[PDB]
Amino acid sequence: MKATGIVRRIDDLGRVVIPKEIRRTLRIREGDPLEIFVDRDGEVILKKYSPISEL
Amino acid sequence: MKATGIVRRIDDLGRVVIPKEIRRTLRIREGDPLEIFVDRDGEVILKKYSPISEL
């Protein structure tokens, strides 16, 4: 589950501004890749890509 | 599952530029809320907030 639960209203483009605090727990930076894929209805899952989701 | 699988390397801020194609399947727009919460390791889940995940 993990869960942080920070709701973000996209913007005038469609990005979701992911605070560095999550990439911080990722231990990554402004070069962290993510895999944008929705799981179910409207939950988009962003996955670090480099190790995929687990390898 | 669903899955789209579009990898995006954050940026010099940390947003995940979510294509309107997903917000389109959301039937929403530049006022779509999402709940940023990671599931396990580095998979961040963004969900529309308004109906939450599934009410």
Side-chain angles (χ1 to χ4, degrees), chain B:
Chain B
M1 173 179 290
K2 273 300 302 178
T4 42
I6 164 62
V7 164
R8 135 65 63 168
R9 196 153 53 221
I10 29 48
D11 80 288
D12 53 89
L13 197 286
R15 319 102 162 181
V16 313
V17 183
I18 294 299
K20 51 283 287 285
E21 62 183 274
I22 301 90
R23 142 251 285 225
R24 163 167 285 170
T25 308
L26 259 307
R27 273 68 58 127
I28 321 180
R29 80 313 176 166
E30 288 82 6
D32 168 52
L34 316 111
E35 182 179 313
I36 288 75
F37 83 91
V38 44
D39 191 83
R40 44 227 188 222
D41 175 64
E43 24 279 292
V44 203
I45 287 60
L46 331 160
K47 132 269 312 218
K48 39 216 292 190
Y49 179 48
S50 183
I52 325 180
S53 43
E54 63 184 293
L55 291 183

Side-chain angles (χ1 to χ4, degrees), chain A residues 36-55:
Chain A
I36 287 69
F37 85 93
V38 47
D39 188 73
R40 24 214 192 238
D41 177 71
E43 335 209 27
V44 207
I45 289 59
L46 324 164
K47 155 204 304 181
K48 35 215 294 195
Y49 170 57
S50 45
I52 325 181
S53 48
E54 55 196 295
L55 284 178

